[PDB]
Design a protein around this motif. Structure first.
Motif: not given
Ligand SMILES: *[C@@H]1O[C@H](CO)[C@@H](O[C@@H]2O[C@H](CO)[C@@H](O[C@@H]3O[C@H](CO)[C@@H](O)[C@H](O)[C@@H]3O)[C@H](O)[C@H]2NC(C)=O)[C@H](O)[C@H]1NC(C)=O
Ligand SMILES: *[C@@H]1O[C@H](CO)[C@@H](O[C@@H]2O[C@H](CO)[C@@H](O[C@@H]3O[C@H](CO)[C@@H](O)[C@H](O)[C@@H]3O)[C@H](O)[C@H]2NC(C)=O)[C@H](O)[C@H]1NC(C)=O
Ligand SMILES: *[C@@H]1O[C@H](CO)[C@@H](O[C@@H]2O[C@H](CO)[C@@H](O[C@@H]3O[C@H](CO)[C@@H](O)[C@H](O)[C@@H]3O)[C@H](O)[C@H]2NC(C)=O)[C@H](O)[C@H]1NC(C)=O
Ligand SMILES: *[C@@H]1O[C@H](CO)[C@@H](O[C@@H]2O[C@H](CO)[C@@H](O[C@@H]3O[C@H](CO)[C@@H](O)[C@H](O)[C@@H]3O)[C@H](O)[C@H]2NC(C)=O)[C@H](O)[C@H]1NC(C)=O
Ligand SMILES: *[C@@H]1O[C@H](CO)[C@@H](O[C@@H]2O[C@H](CO)[C@@H](O)[C@H](O)[C@H]2NC(C)=O)[C@H](O)[C@H]1NC(C)=O
Ligand SMILES: *[C@@H]1O[C@H](CO)[C@@H](O[C@@H]2O[C@H](CO)[C@@H](O)[C@H](O)[C@H]2NC(C)=O)[C@H](O)[C@H]1NC(C)=O
Ligand SMILES: *[C@@H]1O[C@H](CO)[C@@H](O[C@@H]2O[C@H](CO)[C@@H](O)[C@H](O)[C@H]2NC(C)=O)[C@H](O)[C@H]1NC(C)=O
Ligand SMILES: *[C@@H]1O[C@H](CO)[C@@H](O[C@@H]2O[C@H](CO)[C@@H](O)[C@H](O)[C@H]2NC(C)=O)[C@H](O)[C@H]1NC(C)=O
Ligand SMILES: *[C@@H]1O[C@H](CO)[C@@H](O[C@@H]2O[C@H](CO)[C@@H](O)[C@H](O)[C@H]2NC(C)=O)[C@H](O)[C@H]1NC(C)=O
Ligand SMILES: *[C@@H]1O[C@H](CO)[C@@H](O[C@@H]2O[C@H](CO)[C@@H](O)[C@H](O)[C@H]2NC(C)=O)[C@H](O)[C@H]1NC(C)=O
Ligand SMILES: *[C@@H]1O[C@H](CO)[C@@H](O[C@@H]2O[C@H](CO)[C@@H](O)[C@H](O)[C@H]2NC(C)=O)[C@H](O)[C@H]1NC(C)=O
Ligand SMILES: *[C@@H]1O[C@H](CO)[C@@H](O[C@@H]2O[C@H](CO)[C@@H](O)[C@H](O)[C@H]2NC(C)=O)[C@H](O)[C@H]1NC(C)=O
Ligand SMILES: *[C@@H]1O[C@H](CO)[C@@H](O[C@@H]2O[C@H](CO)[C@@H](O)[C@H](O)[C@H]2NC(C)=O)[C@H](O)[C@H]1NC(C)=O
Ligand SMILES: *[C@@H]1O[C@H](CO)[C@@H](O)[C@H](O)[C@H]1NC(C)=O
Ligand SMILES: *[C@@H]1O[C@H](CO)[C@@H](O)[C@H](O)[C@H]1NC(C)=O
Ligand SMILES: *[C@@H]1O[C@H](CO)[C@@H](O)[C@H](O)[C@H]1NC(C)=O
Ligand SMILES: *[C@@H]1O[C@H](CO)[C@@H](O)[C@H](O)[C@H]1NC(C)=O
Ligand SMILES: *[C@@H]1O[C@H](CO)[C@@H](O)[C@H](O)[C@H]1NC(C)=O
Ligand SMILES: *[C@@H]1O[C@H](CO)[C@@H](O)[C@H](O)[C@H]1NC(C)=O
Ligand SMILES: *[C@@H]1O[C@H](CO)[C@@H](O)[C@H](O)[C@H]1NC(C)=O
Ligand SMILES: *[C@@H]1O[C@H](CO)[C@@H](O)[C@H](O)[C@H]1NC(C)=O
Ligand SMILES: *[C@@H]1O[C@H](CO)[C@@H](O)[C@H](O)[C@H]1NC(C)=O
Ligand SMILES: *[C@@H]1O[C@H](CO)[C@@H](O)[C@H](O)[C@H]1NC(C)=O
Ligand SMILES: *[C@@H]1O[C@H](CO)[C@@H](O)[C@H](O)[C@H]1NC(C)=O
Ligand SMILES: *[C@@H]1O[C@H](CO)[C@@H](O)[C@H](O)[C@H]1NC(C)=O
Ligand SMILES: *[C@@H]1O[C@H](CO)[C@@H](O)[C@H](O)[C@H]1NC(C)=O
Ligand SMILES: *[C@@H]1O[C@H](CO)[C@@H](O)[C@H](O)[C@H]1NC(C)=O
Ligand SMILES: *[C@@H]1O[C@H](CO)[C@@H](O)[C@H](O)[C@H]1NC(C)=O
Ligand SMILES: *[C@@H]1O[C@H](CO)[C@@H](O)[C@H](O)[C@H]1NC(C)=O
Lengths: 445, 131, 130, 127, 48
Positions: A3-8, A437-444, B73-74
């Motif tokens: 799980x990863x936090x995401x801002x809205x 929380x969302x199951x996503x990450x920022x791609x590098x 976010x990462x």
């Protein structure tokens, strides 16, 4: 955990904060309300279901801002009018005798005095009619105005009118106005039917002290609101679901005469009356007032004991603005005696009445002895047809075992009149920051 | 489809709705987000709204979201903050309850989001300097 | 190359030019876009200009153009708005005539752009969930 | 604990010594006569911040604090080594002479970013 | 117009002539009447 936090951004979060509202009007214009932007056509009403907001009056800043705005608008409206400083002179005054009645005997006075003109090198002897409450004895005796020992004041200009045109309060950017759509909304509590709106509805800023004139009606029945029902020092606001018609009139055919007191400026004095002179009065239907009082007693029996004797009494004492019902009628300020409306008791189980009213020319109506305003006379008879939709009661505590409950009209403060109408609206601040929380990450890259 | 109009949800219409349903109406709230005594008061309110908007945009700018509404976010999500299933919060909870539930940690959460992005930023820097 | 002087096109100098010619004069317009009664009136004018620029920046921010002047969009261009050839709409038409031609469809384009970007962000979020 | 630096603490430091404490300074940019005076100064500060953000958004630094550009640096403006200017020189000293030549630099950055955007648009059109 | 006299009511010799007891006709709350009132003033802000 994956799980990863995401801002809205732009999330609907409501916070309670102070906000300066914006004025709006339907929009020749008068009362100097052109200083604010006019209202937008067809205001948006958005219902907000599945949410309950804890509405609480007596602490909302909208009524305080409305009081401050009304005071500021009145002060700015009295600014271009001429000051009345040369009136503080010796007045050789006497009574009136021409067609005077028994009840009006001694109420009006014929005062003669020397006043300046456009030429500073000479004066002129004029005469005018003043009420008894407007003059005081210095010692054909000499008299003086009641505001001479206090600060002088201006008069209402004849071009401006006292018509209480409705105004709207629009929230600025980032804030919202919430309105409670509950038919039986209490004084404080969670409103089930909440709906946001861009601007408030048409609110007429009338001036009254005992009877709410031209106020907003209820939804289905008369409502009783109070911050502390058990406290005798707290005002009790009563809202009517039906309007009680009232007919106020002044049969005196007063004549206004303009006398030059300086360069260009003039003073509007009361000339000779035409015909018979009678006391101004207000008529209220007996049947409508009786059934309205019965409905009020029925609603008060729900809060207190229903087997408790109830009785209405007149005002105890104090200033004339608090004891007598003060309002305005066609530019003429009236102070009516409400002893005939609160002279009944109710046990546990065609015809109209008249109320005499006094007329004053020096009116403050805001407990600001710092200043006043001279009401100029109005030509012809005065007629006003309106309808009261509320009351401002006060409990006269001191008894015990819930016996002999008495109610008297009061509420000298000007905030109750606006609190009885701005109770549905609330100002909320929008917080666009949110996290989830969302199951996503920022791609590098 | 040429003779049909465009209708969306009103301002704060999804306040009492679920998170998944309220996540598609952020555009209207974001768009709605933006005698001298009266003039001074009106200008002060307008300016105050301007620093609030710029403060929000500056708080988002220090993170890896240069203006987009929804962004990932990462940093990992600490399970100790809520200890609840994602399905029930996104399908059986409004944004108001979620806001008052974790109103304490948000501030320190913002701080990690900020420094983390800071070191994350120099990460591409010591790689982009290899060209 | 030590005494070389650099001059650019003036403010709004590419108004009468073509679309392609005026497409390279966006930076100059973007940078040039930014006793009590006189002070309050000038302050209100400056605040209004700042608010207008903020609204325009937010309008480009809700879309997929957070900062870049030139940006594309996956939604197609329907011929109902303007059915003109690309070879002549970019070389035989100015920005004024073209803006006055489809001025009645700007709101529809803005609405479809914002909903397309919202669904694009939702699709990107669902794609990152894999 | 963690202590990095304060506001403007790297004024006397060199270029490299001040290259990592730029983010705190980045957030640091944000009777009635005194009220209108405060409002006027506040509006001026907001205008300066928006002007700086707009100039950064024009280039390829819309939301980045550190960014490089594809324009070749002209040696006539500096005439010095990289290590010497990045290890034995401060920001104030460089600012004393780059002030006359910052207009041409800003203009070339704007036209180059516009040219890069045009090239990117052509690349996207030709797929 | 002010009518001032010298004060000699337990005054030290260092201030002989510094304080003046002035009397004047000043208007009252009523514009048609005036009153004769006195006040003390200094020699620095009073000229003949
Ligand atoms: C208030 O008192 C004043 C006097 O202080 C009253 O003024 C009165 O005005 C009438 C009308 O101008 C005077 O009548 C005169 O009649 C003769 C003929 O008999 C005529 O030649 C004159 O030109 C004038 O019209 C009257 O004398 C005068 N009263 C006095 C004592 O001089 C005024 O009417 C009073 N107002 C009220 C409401 O009682
Ligand atoms: C409560 O509302 C009623 C109406 O809903 C108000 O009655 C209206 O009052 C105005 C101003 O006093 C009257 O206007 C006047 O009309 C005459 C007609 O010749 C004109 O000559 C005057 O210059 C003035 O414009 C109006 O007739 C009257 N009635 C109606 C049906 O509108 C009442 O005044 C309100 N109560 C308060 C305390 O303001
Ligand atoms: C306020 O709450 C009520 C009660 O939940 C909402 O009514 C219904 O809410 C559901 C879930 O949010 C909506 O989705 C439906 O879910 C069911 C499973 O329970 C599924 O089988 C359906 O295919 C559909 O996806 C549903 O549309 C909705 N309305 C109904 C049943 O008429 C209501 O929507 C809430 N109000 C707001 C403004 O969100
Ligand atoms: C964009 O919208 C505007 C506003 O609706 C359109 O302007 C309107 O254009 C029509 C013709 O296209 C005008 O009608 C004219 O009426 C007169 C009198 O009947 C007639 O003699 C002319 O031959 C013509 O038919 C209309 O006046 C004009 N304005 C309004 C307010 O309707 C404009 O055409 C639209 N542009 C596009 C590309 O859709
Ligand atoms: C208005 O002025 C007239 C004349 O200036 C006053 O009438 C008389 O004035 C003299 C002074 O010149 C007095 O001695 C008399 O006593 C006055 N007569 C009366 C009957 O009072 C008149 O009094 C002035 N009016 C007022 C209200 O002061
Ligand atoms: C509301 O009114 C009631 C009744 O007067 C208040 O209750 C009493 O208040 C007095 C003075 O504030 C206290 O000395 C008593 O101890 C109170 N009684 C009890 C049983 O607590 C009450 O405080 C008022 N306010 C609220 C918020 O309820
Ligand atoms: C106040 O005056 C109005 C005058 O219009 C009264 O209105 C009456 O209303 C009834 C209702 O049908 C009519 O039949 C009458 O003809 C109206 N009167 C007149 C003179 O036309 C109203 O009743 C009065 N209210 C009070 C409390 O006196
Ligand atoms: C009495 O109060 C009502 C509500 O505040 C005023 O409004 C009218 O009431 C009548 C009868 O209830 C309706 O038929 C009208 O549609 C209402 N609106 C208007 C615009 O007339 C009513 O004006 C008040 N009475 C008087 C005499 O002013
Ligand atoms: C935030 O943390 C506090 C503990 O520090 C939680 O408890 C609150 O504590 C304050 C005083 O410290 C009380 O006034 C509140 O009534 C407490 N809240 C409750 C619900 O009892 C608080 O709940 C936390 N808030 C969150 C997690 O949103
Ligand atoms: C105004 O229009 C003229 C005419 O097109 C432009 O001048 C050039 O004209 C030749 C004619 O063959 C074209 O081939 C060129 O493409 C035109 N130049 C450009 C830059 O397009 C002139 O440049 C235009 N000026 C402005 C300010 O719009
Ligand atoms: C002021 O200057 C001195 C020397 O120019 C700096 O001292 C250096 O500190 C760094 C670590 O902070 C060391 O790696 C260097 O070796 C030191 N230099 C020397 C010559 O010993 C000092 O940090 C500077 N202070 C500020 C605030 O810039
Ligand atoms: C930047 O511009 C200033 C002024 O335009 C230059 O200042 C000159 O300095 C020299 C030596 O100090 C003087 O002899 C000149 O008279 C100054 N110029 C003027 C107009 O007074 C400064 O040298 C310029 N910087 C660089 C790096 O060339
Ligand atoms: C205040 O006014 C009175 C008059 O009301 C002055 O007293 C005298 O009045 C007569 C006329 O009745 C004059 O002829 C005298 O010149 C006045 N003065 C004196 C000293 O007799 C009085 O003097 C005035 N006071 C001041 C301080 O000017
Ligand atoms: C002015 O006179 C009235 C007359 O009774 C008195 O009640 C009031 O207190 C006086 N005001 C001042 C400020 O002297
Ligand atoms: C409704 O208001 C009255 C008056 O303040 C109060 O006594 C009562 O407790 C309230 N009831 C609810 C349910 O809020
Ligand atoms: C008042 O007096 C004037 C004098 O001419 C007259 O015209 C008017 O009709 C009178 N009004 C009433 C109500 O008697
Ligand atoms: C009020 O009622 C009285 C009778 O009690 C009547 O004489 C008078 O004319 C009425 N006035 C109005 C304005 O209806
Ligand atoms: C008022 O109405 C009640 C209805 O319960 C009635 O009993 C009472 O007699 C009425 N009083 C008057 C004065 O009409
Ligand atoms: C009226 O009072 C009696 C007294 O006991 C009570 O039983 C009854 O429920 C009350 N009715 C209402 C409607 O309050
Ligand atoms: C209230 O009524 C009583 C009895 O009728 C009376 O003595 C008193 O003066 C009245 N007070 C007021 C303010 O009307
Ligand atoms: C109001 O009327 C009653 C009726 O008797 C009277 O006692 C009271 O004094 C009046 N109020 C005033 C202020 O005159
Ligand atoms: C008030 O009511 C009592 C009850 O009988 C009555 O005697 C008195 O005359 C009434 N007073 C007024 C002013 O209506
Ligand atoms: C234009 O055409 C596209 C596909 O070619 C379609 O998706 C869109 O709805 C059309 N728009 C209108 C207004 O006809
Ligand atoms: C999560 O929070 C706890 C305390 O609530 C803390 O001890 C821990 O370090 C945090 N991080 C992780 C990854 O568990
Ligand atoms: C969370 O969901 C999982 C499966 O999705 C389930 O096994 C578990 O019991 C749930 N936990 C709670 C507290 O509901
Ligand atoms: C140096 O600057 C001039 C402009 O003053 C420019 O024309 C020249 O091409 C530059 N030199 C290099 C090598 O970029
Ligand atoms: C547009 O292009 C087509 C060929 O693709 C051509 O037949 C037509 O004439 C062109 N129209 C214009 C106005 O250039
Ligand atoms: C760069 O470094 C070399 C080697 O130390 C030195 O010879 C040269 O002078 C330096 N360049 C400048 C401009 O000082
Ligand atoms: C008052 O005292 C001063 C200073 O001693 C003197 O010049 C003046 O003549 C005195 N005046 C009178 C009236 O005594």
């Amino acid at each position: 955990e994956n799980l990863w936090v995401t801002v809205y951004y732009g999330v609907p979060v409501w916070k309670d904060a102070e906000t300066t509202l914006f004025c709006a009007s339907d929009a020749h214009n008068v009362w100097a309300t052109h200083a604010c932007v006019p209202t937008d056509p067809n205001p948006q009403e958005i219902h907000l279901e599945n949410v309950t907001e804890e509405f609480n009056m007596w602490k909302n800043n909208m009524v305080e801002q409305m009081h401050t705005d009304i005071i500021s608008l009145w002060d700015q409206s009295l600014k271009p009018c001429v000051k009345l400083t040369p009136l503080c002179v010796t007045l050789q005054c006497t009574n009136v005798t021409n067609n005077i009645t028994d009840d009006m005997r001694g109420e009006l006075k014929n005062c003669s005095f020397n006043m300046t003109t456009e030429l500073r090198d000479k004066k002129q002897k004029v005469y005018s009619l003043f009420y008894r409450l407007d003059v005081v004895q210095i010692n054909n005796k000499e008299y003086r105005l009641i505001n001479c020992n206090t600060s002088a004041c201006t008069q209402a200009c004849p071009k401006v009118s006292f018509e209480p045109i409705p105004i709207h309060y629009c929230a600025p950017a980032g804030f919202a106005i919430l309105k409670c759509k509950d038919k039986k909304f209490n004084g404080t509590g969670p409103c089930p039917s909440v709906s946001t709106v861009q601007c408030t509805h048409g609110i007429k800023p009338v001036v009254s002290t005992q009877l709410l004139l031209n106020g907003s009606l209820a939804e289905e029945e008369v409502m009783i609101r109070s911050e502390n029902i058990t406290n005798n020092a707290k005002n009790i606001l009563v809202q009517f679901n039906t309007p009680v018609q009232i007919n106020c009139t002044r049969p005196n055919n007063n004549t206004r005469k303009s006398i030059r007191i300086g360069p260009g400026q003039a003073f509007y004095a009361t000339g000779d009356i035409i015909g018979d002179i009678r006391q101004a009065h207000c008529n209220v239907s007996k049947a409508t007032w009786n059934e309205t009082l019965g409905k009020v007693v029925k609603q008060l029996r729900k809060h207190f004991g229903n087997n408790t004797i109830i009785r209405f009494a007149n005002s105890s004492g104090g200033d004339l603005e608090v004891t007598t019902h003060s309002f305005n009628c066609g530019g003429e300020f009236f102070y009516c005696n409400t002893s005939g409306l609160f002279n009944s008791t109710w046990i546990s189980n065609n015809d109209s009445i008249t109320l005499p009213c006094r007329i004053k020319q020096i009116i403050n109506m805001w407990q600001r002895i710092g200043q006043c305003m001279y009401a100029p006379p109005i030509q012809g008879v005065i007629r006003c047809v309106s309808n009261i939709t509320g009351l401002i009661l006060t409990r006269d505590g001191g008894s015990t075992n819930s016996t002999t409950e008495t109610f008297r009209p009061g509420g000298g403060d000007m905030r109750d009149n606006w609190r009885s109408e701005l109770y549905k609206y609330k100002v909320v601040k929008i917080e666009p920051l949110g996290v989830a929380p969302t199951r996503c990450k920022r791609r590098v890259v | 489809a040429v003779g049909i109009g465009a209708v969306f949800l009103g301002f704060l219409g999804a306040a009492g709705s679920t998170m998944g349903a309220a996540s598609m109406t952020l555009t209207v709230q974001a768009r709605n987000l933006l005698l001298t005594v009266w003039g001074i008061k009106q200008l002060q309110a307008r300016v105050l709204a301007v620093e609030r908007y710029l403060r929000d945009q500056q708080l988002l700018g220090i993170w890896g979201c240069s203006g987009k509404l929804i962004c990932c976010t990462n940093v990992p999500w600490n399970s100790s903050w809520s200890n609840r299933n994602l399905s029930e919060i996104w399908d059986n909870m409004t944004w108001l309850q979620w806001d008052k539930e974790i109103s304490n940690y948000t501030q320190i959460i913002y701080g990690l989001l900020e420094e983390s992005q800071n070191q994350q930023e120099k990460n591409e820097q010591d790689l982009l300097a290899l060209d």
